[PDB]
Design a protein around this ligand. Structure first.
Ligand SMILES: OC[C@H]1O[C@@H](O)[C@H](O)[C@@H](O)[C@H]1O
Ligand SMILES: OC[C@H]1O[C@@H](O)[C@H](O)[C@@H](O)[C@H]1O
Ligand code: NA
Ligand code: NA
Ligand code: NA
Ligand code: NA
Ligand code: NA
Ligand code: NA
Lengths: 989, 989
């Protein structure tokens, strides 16, 4: 009985443990003068749901194409209507039984016709820079080979197959393969030919590969140069010319350049060079820099550096894994403009042309191999490819192609073996191969905490506490004394930290202080640079970002893919504005008396000569003084005290007490740079003269009683509820206490540790904080002064089925135009639920006004949001925004938009203006309620109801990073307590 | 400063700790010849949202009514559009701060005008049999008093206030009050005047109260009679006449009737009697019965009884707490028709007229006081009213009114203090008062396990295991030796068990066997008799039941209120059909050789004379023999062997081996009874001659191969999937393994005990059993016989991100008209997920046919559903139902409708008929998929898709009662295992 199933041969190849077949040896991506023809453009595309039904109808010949339609290449083909994107975090979307593939496996047949001139003969090749996940290539019906390693390059010799004139290239691409088991990155599954397809002629006496070695001797200032060149795998004679350095040398010999300017992220000096043979010349950019590890420190050019990094995925909200070059250049400029100096290519090699941009603009790069077996962890790592000898050749090939393609770029300061691939023999083989091939770059890999096969100790999301212990070299020892000795001598890097999902991240400052304090700490890379939002249109035709589950996924991880510092279209989130400030390379501490400021140069190589230091005094009326001050260049890691012009201090001394004024000192770019224009702000510091506490109004107005209402100055109260129904003519629909906010993404993550691991959001729902009720205890008027009186409204707030509550007393007073409101909160009973203490999100008030708000103005921190453990980027000053701009457009709507540290606020309700003053309070204004905010899964779900929701908080809790990593730090928690705060209110015109 | 809040006086009264004021002393509900006028009818009604806004506009006078509309009385006013029903189980719908009430407190003003003739003068009263929760009564503007105790009666003297001719009765009713804290029953919150309002004249020289004492001496056969009568609280002269017993005695003296026929639920003998004074006569029904506890047994009339009970709430799907009398009589008849003999009035006194019906039809009643403080448990019982001295008078009053109203009814065999009210001094006071007032009835209360203040040990939902230990008197001792000694001498009752929520209850038989084995076990009362469904109309105007959350409740407990043996309209659920069989009072064990049957009379007092014993032999063709057999009366608790006519045994011996035949012996009512007609089935037993195993067809037909399809006899296979696409012309859309079902209500409850307490449904979702995927491993044909061949299809079933799976091999064979299918299941890897073993719901197959099914016929158990731990009521036989009737109309759609123990089945698909045969399998047929079933929250969500979903299960797990109480018993669990089963298929005409 023979087999009767269909497509067994294709499936067998997809289940292969080996790398691609028939490809040329892996080499560097090189700029060559050899003729080249990009086959990018409109191809023909046919999709089948599985290998067994994929036609075998001679389509590769390009004749009588049945069912082929136009598709752009490069492309992620679910982004163009063929199937749909699917997002999983850790879980595989298919049964875990390596190397087998599911029956539902989209098969994409690609085909293009192109013309090959005489310059592509007798020798040429076809280059595929990326195919997810398994490709089979035919040229004029002849099989060239297959591709494995979705983000790795492949080249196929077409000599003797490429015909002069017309040619037909056919590529069958399977979404899933055995390789899928080693490409389990937390991102969208997106098959397709998503990177360049190039025809390249290979003239005789040419250059196939080049290995640049450009060291730097920081003591002598010498450059140490050796440029290797090869052809057919053999070292060849070639001449290297570096005009700027006045040298001409042979390829293969090490020379010593007397004086070079070293390359660094701060100063990305690049020397143009060319290596050429008889038939081919290659253009190179050489950055002289040496990487070393000594005294448990990661050093470049003799100096410990601080990594100010982000994890960079490759994503585009409409093109998937295809990132247009202009978007790449733009986002890298945006990175530099926010003081970022390092990038981790999470978790695969980037587009080949990315690295030249990193060399030029200046980033310390961690270039990561395309390897991740995260989905095997849930089974105790059973069958993990990283430890299965059958996968050794496949994984070594991945590392080899990774190293070879990018080995020439100065920006690459570390090789990374992969991400969350467990531990295993194959990872060790990948390390041995890299160390032997390129000893000039340390090896990184977080998955093996013993650090046996790496040169740096890496972790992800380690708490601030553990980072401090590691920074001091006092973390607990490894069981193996030899391995422990090796790891204690390593510097420490956080390859991922301060998870930037939604509102947040909190606790960035605590990490940064440790980075600066402890030399063993190399820094960290934020997770993540961008959100993987995919643009989606509503039924009405309105755009919004979609995430996991929005594309019919059976298995998905929701909005975990939107966890970035910028949105998919590179619009900054508030977290990026705080991050920029946190990692600012200069520290400016303005003296309290405004006589000067302390300036610390936190850079590693550059002085302060590139910066202009400017000062401005601003008051309510506007700018009162300002200018520039000359600062003798401060060396890196040194500091000085800079005197400010006497007019500034004199101005401060002359300010009448209680008048607010802000002195801001800024360090800006004196001249244009490659990544920003002159005047771009790099660092800043402030000193504030705080406005005096607000004086309560005199209680001279009395309480006028009627059957259904009480009136006190401009306030009309409902006698049935005791709450105001009108203030200065502004209708007040509701006023009450608040202890809860719409859970953030962090609030939805588990609070690991302790007997309670419910997410904070669940603790809140269980405790009833989202559904508070208020009982009126009494209302009474009391003698004020000169015939006036105060109005005290006693209430108790609690929730259904709970015995705990808070007594809340509102004491109202007015002089005729200013209303004084004193709120006093007292706990009644122990706030415990399901055996665990309840925590509060805030202690504040909610004013629901019966009219819309057009404009919100305030004095405090701004312009963007700030919570207790965030808001570093929000500076003191006066701000004014239309209501819509107070909000934050997170993909999943959640708590956001609070302005902490506010002293005064003004809401423009049509013709009238409501002014709120008081001791420091957080300010939030929205056109929709908190329940609408919490219920909303996407932004279109938010709809204005014609009201104004004003939140005035006496206290807030932090936002932390509980979605992944540490929760809110102790000092930012908000446990139930008694509280009393005063406000003044006033309506105008 | 005086108070300025509104409505403080009304709120203060609602927060009162005391019982109602101004009411006459509690007394018995008595049938009197005194004139009476029912004020039931169309009243005028106005609703306000709270006390502070409830108008004080002289409405009580009935003049210039502003905002009053017609409302029927009695009524639950949310059932008539005023507000909405709200359902909570344990949680209070308001903040727990007794005795305070929330600001949102619906206030219902009721008013009616009526005419009072001269017969209601000079003395009369107004009687209110129920007001939820706090009423204030005015007559002609004069305040009569207030009412507390929502299900208790209140009477107010109107002498001197009632005017001849026209009168105006006004009643203000607040939904919530301090009383709400002691009326936290698991049911709908439904305010209103929901029971009779009656005007009763009180002529002089009348009778106010009567206390019947009717004992029975089982040794002598004597009745022990004393009828007490009182007026104005004083014993009065009155004559008692019991014509049937030929006696005339004075009220107040104990007499000894020489020979009476005793009262019991089995024989509810009632003697008509009248006690009369000069101005009034009262009609009574006297049942002579004595209740005693000895030898740790609950005995009536000298015999231990077995309680076959249900917990009876008062609910109506359209009228709320108002249960029309015809519905009461109907449902009680339905109870008797299902062998029920006991009722617990959970958790409050019923309508006063309920008790006469219980006396007449025959039920052992546990009459329960209106008391439940369950919502205080979550706070450790802090502030529990049951232990707060301030509530003593209120709780004693509740018990007093409970006892006094119903003290004369023979059906009441126990007083219950309340339900889930914790422990406390006030419960002890309620016990002391009852014992002193009426020592003739034992006291019940489950809330105090020490049983200090009760006469029986009661528990709810104790496992079968613990019930067995208690039945043997070997449960662990109480810490207090004196209390332990007292409790060990008590009989044991399960006041609630086998929670009948949704599909279920399972494990009933295991309880019943213990009840029969151990005399200390009194029996049990199922929770619950009825579902509290409330009829709701869809947008299209289609009716369906709603539950918690369907009425906009902020806080609710979902479908926990639909947990009954019948639906709200008293349609039986399958659980009632099984319950009837489980509690059948006779046991019939039919001999294997069909020569006779063993008959055990399980009754306590009656013999078998009331029953006719009938037998029938049925085969495929129909009835072959049948008739009646005479049985000499068997005494209660005795047994005999009854010979059957020789024709039956002879018929059995002559049956050709393999021919199915069923002998059923039934005990039916020989004559009409008060609760059913002659021929009503009470008990039954069966003996089955099983049809032989099905012979696989000869594999003489070969496999015909084509590019895209394989054909084997009448089966067309898809060569790409290996699955059949057509059988005998019937389109087969899908065929695959099943391990999962739409979770039942029990599957959604926590599996208490052990480290894993996730509900089974959650264990299933986490494990991916609901989203299985199948990979084709191979297809091959193999030599059969005489040129034919078998077709083997090798597959592996698993789920995304899981390493465990099952290998499934389908071996097909056919002779031309009969198809043989052998399925073999083998585990691949350990089925563990999140550190806990995965369990399966079933091991079976799902046939998705591309045509609708009109009729389903089968031989096995029926007619209704049966699962491993249920189906007691499903008997062996041949059954046929239209597809719609195979389903079970549970309010929340869930797994149901499986017919376990099936040997053959026939689906009528239009003109064709699909016949399935095989060894025992469970059968299910539906017009919608399991995912549609699981996603459906209400029945309208189920919609046919034009297909047929046929489920053939080799194994099923039990359903248990995990929603509340024990889960599936060990012997009914389904752990992953290897399995192999054979089926035969055949399509006709
Ligand atoms: O929580 C999972 C974490 O694992 C990392 O390896 C991954 O890159 C991110 O998705 C991060 O969130
Ligand atoms: O689960 C709670 C249980 O508590 C009982 O006292 C109540 O009558 C029922 O609702 C039952 O389900
Ligand atoms: Na495939
Ligand atoms: Na987010
Ligand atoms: Na993510
Ligand atoms: Na009220
Ligand atoms: Na149910
Ligand atoms: Na219930």
């Amino acid at each position: 009985g023979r087999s009767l199933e269909l497509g067994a041969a294709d499936i067998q190849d997809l289940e292969s443990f080996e790398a691609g077949r028939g490809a040329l040896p892996a080499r560097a991506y090189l700029q060559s003068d050899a003729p080249r023809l990009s086959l990018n453009g409109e191809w023909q595309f046919r999709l089948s749901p599985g290998s067994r039904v994929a036609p075998d109808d001679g389509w590769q010949l390009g004749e009588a194409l049945n069912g082929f339609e136009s598709l752009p290449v490069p492309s992620s083909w679910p982004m163009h209507g063929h199937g749909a994107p699917a997002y999983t975090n850790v879980q595989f979307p298919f049964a875990v039984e390596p190397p087998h593939v599911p029956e539902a496996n989209p098969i994409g047949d690609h085909l293009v016709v192109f013309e090959a001139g005489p310059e592509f003969f007798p020798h040429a090749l076809l280059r595929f820079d990326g195919i997810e996940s398994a490709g089979t290539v035919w040229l004029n019906g002849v099989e060239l080979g297959t591709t494995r390693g979705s983000r790795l390059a492949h080249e196929f010799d077409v000599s003797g197959i490429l015909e002069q004139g017309e040619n037909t290239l056919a590529v069958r691409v399977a979404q899933f393969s055995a390789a899928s088991y080693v490409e389990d990155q937390d991102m969208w599954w997106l098959p397709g030919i998503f990177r360049d397809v190039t025809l390249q002629a290979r003239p005789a006496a040419g250059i196939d590969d080049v290995f640049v070695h450009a060291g730097y001797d920081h003591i002598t200032g010498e450059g140490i140069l050796k440029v290797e060149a090869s052809r057919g795998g053999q070292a060849i004679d070639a001449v290297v010319r570096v005009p700027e350095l006045a040298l001409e040398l042979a390829a293969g010999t090490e020379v010593r350049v007397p004086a070079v300017e070293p390359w660094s992220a701060e100063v990305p000096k690049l020397y143009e060079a060319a290596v050429s043979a008889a038939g081919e010349s290659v253009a190179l950019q050489i950055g002289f820099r040496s990487i070393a590890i000594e005294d448990a420190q990661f050093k470049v050019n003799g100096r410990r550096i601080l990594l100010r990094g982000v994890n960079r995925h490759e994503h585009h909200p409409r093109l998937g894994r295809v990132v247009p070059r202009d978007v790449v250049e733009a986002e890298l400029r945006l990175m530099k403009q926010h003081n970022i100096n390092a990038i981790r290519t999470s978790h695969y090699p980037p587009h080949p042309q990315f690295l030249a941009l990193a060399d030029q603009l200046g980033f310390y790069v961690v270039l990561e191999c395309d390897l991740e077996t995260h989905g095997f962890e849930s089974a105790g790592w059973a069958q993990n490819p990283s430890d299965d000898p059958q996968w050794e050749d496949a994984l070594v090939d991945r590392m080899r192609r990774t190293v070879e393609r990018d080995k020439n770029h100065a920006s690459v300061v570390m090789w990374s073996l992969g991400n969350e691939a467990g531990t295993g023999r194959n990872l060790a083989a990948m390390s041995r191969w890299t160390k032997d091939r390129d000893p000039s770059r340390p090896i990184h890999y977080e998955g093996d905490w013993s650090s046996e096969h790496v040169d740096v100790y890496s972790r992800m999301y380690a708490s601030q506490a553990e980072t401090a212990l590691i920074g001091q070299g006092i973390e607990p020892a490894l069981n193996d004394a030899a391995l422990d000795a090796r790891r204690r001598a390593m510097p420490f890097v956080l390859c991922e930290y301060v998870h930037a999902m939604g509102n947040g991240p909190g606790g960035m400052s605590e990490y940064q202080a440790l980075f600066e304090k402890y030399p063993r700490l190399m820094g960290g890379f934020v997770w993540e640079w961008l959100e993987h939002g995919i643009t989606v249109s509503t039924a009405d035709g309105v755009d919004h970002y979609g995430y996991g589950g929005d594309f019919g996924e059976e298995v998905h991880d929701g909005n975990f893919v939107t966890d970035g510092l910028v949105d998919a279209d590179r619009r900054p989130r508030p977290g990026l504005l705080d991050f920029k400030k946190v990692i600012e390379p200069l520290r400016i501490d303005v003296a309290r008396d405004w006589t000067g400021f302390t300036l610390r140069n936190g850079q590693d190589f550059a002085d302060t000569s590139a910066f202009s230091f400017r000062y401005e005094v601003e008051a309510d009326g506007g700018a009162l003084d300002g200018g520039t001050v000359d600062v003798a260049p401060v060396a890196p890691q040194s500091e000085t005290v800079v005197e400010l012009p006497g007019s500034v201090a004199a101005l401060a001394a002359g300010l009448s007490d209680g008048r607010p004024a802000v002195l801001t000192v800024r360090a800006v770019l004196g001249a244009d740079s490659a990544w920003a224009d002159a005047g771009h702000e790099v660092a800043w510091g402030q000193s504030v003269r705080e406005p005096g506490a607000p004086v309560p109004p005199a209680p001279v107005e009395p309480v006028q009683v009627q059957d259904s209402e009480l009136t006190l100055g401009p306030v009309v109260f409902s006698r049935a509820t005791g709450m105001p129904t009108s203030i200065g003519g502004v209708p007040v629909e509701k006023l009450g206490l608040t202890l809860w906010w719409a859970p953030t993404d962090n609030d939805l993550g588990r609070e690991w540790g302790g007997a309670d691991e419910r997410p904070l959001a669940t603790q809140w729902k269980d405790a009833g904080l989202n559904r508070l009720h208020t009982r009126l205890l009494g209302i009474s008027a009391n003698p004020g002064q000169d015939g006036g009186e105060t109005l005290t409204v006693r209430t108790r707030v609690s929730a259904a089925d709970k015995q705990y509550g808070v007594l809340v007393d509102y004491t109202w007073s007015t002089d005729g135009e200013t209303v004084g409101l004193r709120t006093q909160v007292r706990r009644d009973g122990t706030w415990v639920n399901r055996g665990f203490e309840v925590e509060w999100a805030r202690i504040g008030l909610e004013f629901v006004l019966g009219e819309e708000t057009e404009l919100v103005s305030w004095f405090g921190q701004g312009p963007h949001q700030s919570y207790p453990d965030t808001g570093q980027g929000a500076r003191a000053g006066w701000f004014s925004l239309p209501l819509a701009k107070m909000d934050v457009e997170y993909v999943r709507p959640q708590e956001c938009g609070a302005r902490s540290g506010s002293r005064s606020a003004a809401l423009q309700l049509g013709g009238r203006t409501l002014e709120i003053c008081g001791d420091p309070f957080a300010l939030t204004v929205r056109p929709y309620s908190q329940d609408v905010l919490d219920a909303a899964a996407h932004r279109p779900d938010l709809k204005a109801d014609g009201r104004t929701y004003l939140y005035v908080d006496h206290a807030l809790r932090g936002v932390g990073t509980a979605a992944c990593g540490p929760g809110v730090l102790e000092q930012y928690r908000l446990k139930p307590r008694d509280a009393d705060f005063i406000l003044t209110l006033k309506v105008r015109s």
